[PDB]
């Protein structure tokens, strides 16, 4: 079907938001996610459901529409900002705590602190020297932020939120990610644990999502890995051979603008990227606790249900063998000749 | 049953 | 290595107990389970170190020796046994309650209830018309046996045995299984999660034992099957296109006859056939819960302990899906691409 | 981990 549509026109006859050239090409189909109004049932059904939804009128974070570079160097104040720096456009995401279990991973991406004004720098510096190198600022937003920030922290709709959380029986927000990333910067596919309203500030993503229900396409790293959560497939050059279900991978997908809050379900791959020559984009997201698990277990099971039992076999067998290392040996022996 | 399938909490967030 | 070795030579010159035609021929090497006095030190320390071993002279069922079926038939009770019937000389166990999981499966020998003089009179039956049927009784000692059945159990050697148990910390005494059988008679591999004392009363079986660590040679069934615990390879015809590693397979062996009592220890898989053309066997079991798992884990795991965390994925799963049948189909989705 | 090490006790008999 067709991915992100006809790209949409900028109010007072400004040209197109963007063009089928900023998008990367990639080997598997894709279908439009709805784009609709908060006041539309359509919208509540679908988040309801745990389905992607683009919502275009939240206003969620309407005062941090103004934002930009030289707005959040002035006001964001001085504290540390972790800033991923890359010799590639994708930045792979791993755990630092689990990178003791494995010894040969050698990380692509490198994480720096520094200061927003320092980030803001090397910026400058590579753009004026025309290097190769690309970065991704990735840090919550925390007390030591600005006075200017906090009234826009303030200003966000948290009534509008705060009742989807309600109606959702979600938890409580654990977090909210700022992300600056560079014209053309990929995150690749990967599922959260949590809930996320994910509202677009400044420039344009494409977002491709994929259903919890095919993760046997998406072939996810080892739970002790650092890219635990990660798809382990390369977008730009699928193995087929060691990936063979890839090739029946279908995602959603659309490209969210400024004022656009794209909710991203529990479980759901995730595949984002910043439109090439788009300029920075600016993000910043909404991260709940999902609803407590059900004290009457229903069946059938759901996909996402499947996913967590798989981790946490898992998770028990590195604890009860010792070593994550002879979880794959186990589990090879278990079904070998036995149920495969 | 109930200990199997709960959830964790983990994103990509250092 | 050898097998069960020379044959040995009975008390006053009655010749060779046995000879190399009545064993079977299989595709695997064996070498030979130690012959030793219940008073040899080396005796104790392969009990203790859950290694097998025969024991010549426990007189552990001593009273029981001079068990027939004349005897038995006089005094065994006019209780019901279970008695198995097959078309083929492989015995295989299946657990009937778990039958109800796996609608396809239908055994290949059958169990039906009867009083003693009736098994009597069916092997009478048979081989007085030369049939091919064969039959396999067994069947738990329990208080409805006649009086001087309860005399000769009252005889055992309680002191040796209750020694061992102590000494072993071995949970109590579950039950004591009789097995009489035909010449030629197998029960084929398997592994049993109690500790046994095989106490050998009449002719002479041939005895293959395996240790746990050879799991991944074996293939058990799955654990929901009703015939959990019990290799899928047909011994007389392996399948080394299923079950490869079935070519890297050895075997402790052993042939025990009147008076022996091999110690085959928790886990140990064991294949036990009655010789060719040797006449009747009778074998009385002792089986003991194993000793309690240590509050202290201690690394590195032993084998046995690994088949037992496999068993318990496999329950949970079972449990926690709701369904046997899709545990094979999640755990497949767990490893493909990501651990194989 | 104590909880998976656990072991049963199912024998060959009806
Ligand atoms: O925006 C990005 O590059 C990545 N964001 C996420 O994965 C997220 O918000 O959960
Ligand atoms: O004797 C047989 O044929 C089988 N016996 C056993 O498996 C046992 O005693 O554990
Ligand atoms: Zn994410
Ligand atoms: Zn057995």
């Known amino acids: 079907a067709s991915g992100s549509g006809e790209p949409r026109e900028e109010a007072g006859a400004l040209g197109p938001a963007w063009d089928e050239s900023q998008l990367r090409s990639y080997s598997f189909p894709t279908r439009p996610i709805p784009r609709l109004s908060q006041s539309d049932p359509r919208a509540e059904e679908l988040i309801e459901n745990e389905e992607p939804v683009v919502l275009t009128d939240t206003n969620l974070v309407y005062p941090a529409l103004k934002w930009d570079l030289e707005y959040l160097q002035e006001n964001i104040g001085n504290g540390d900002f972790s800033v991923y720096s890359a010799s590639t456009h994708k930045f792979l995401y791993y755990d630092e705590k689990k990178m003791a279990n494995f010894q040969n991973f050698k990380p692509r991406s490198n994480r720096e602190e520094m200061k927003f004004h320092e980030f803001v720098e090397k910026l400058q510096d590579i753009q004026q020297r025309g290097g190769e190198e690309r970065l991704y600022l990735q840090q919550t937003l925390n007390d030591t932020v600005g006075r200017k920030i906090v009234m826009d922290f303030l200003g966000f709709n948290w009534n509008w939120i705060n009742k989807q959380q309600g109606k959702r029986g979600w938890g409580q927000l654990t977090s909210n990610l700022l992300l600056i990333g560079?014209?053309?910067?990929?995150?690749?596919?990967?599922?959260?644990?949590?809930?996320?309203?994910?509202?677009?500030?400044?420039?344009?993503?494409?977002?491709?999502?994929?259903?919890?229900?095919?993760?046997?396409?998406?072939?996810?790293?080892?739970?002790?890995?650092?890219?635990?959560?990660?798809?382990?497939?390369?977008?730009?050059?699928?193995?087929?051979?060691?990936?063979?279900?890839?090739?029946?991978?279908?995602?959603?997908?659309?490209?969210?603008?400024?004022?656009?809050?794209?909710?991203?379900?529990?479980?759901?791959?995730?595949?984002?990227?910043?439109?090439?020559?788009?300029?920075?984009?600016?993000?910043?997201?909404?991260?709940?606790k999902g609803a407590p698990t059900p004290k009457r277990i229903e069946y059938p099971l759901k996909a996402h249900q499947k996913v967590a039992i798989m981790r946490n076999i898992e998770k028990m067998l590195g604890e009860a063998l010792g070593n994550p290392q002879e979880v794959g040996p186990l589990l090879n022996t278990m079904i070998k000749g036995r149920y495969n | 049953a109930a200990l199997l399938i709960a959830a964790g909490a983990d994103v990509n967030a250092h």
Chains 1, 3 share one sequence.
């Open chain 1, 182 to 288: 560079m014209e053309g910067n990929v995150t690749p596919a990967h599922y959260d644990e949590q809930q996320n309203f994910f509202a677009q500030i400044k420039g344009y993503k494409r977002c491709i999502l994929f259903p919890p229900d095919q993760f046997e396409c998406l072939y996810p790293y080892p739970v002790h890995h650092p890219c635990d959560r990660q798809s382990q497939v390369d977008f730009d050059n699928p193995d087929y051979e060691r990936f063979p279900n890839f090739q029946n991978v279908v995602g959603y997908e659309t490209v969210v603008g400024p004022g656009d809050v794209l909710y991203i379900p529990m479980y759901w791959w995730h595949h984002i990227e910043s439109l090439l020559n788009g300029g920075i984009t600016i993000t910043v997201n909404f991260w709940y």
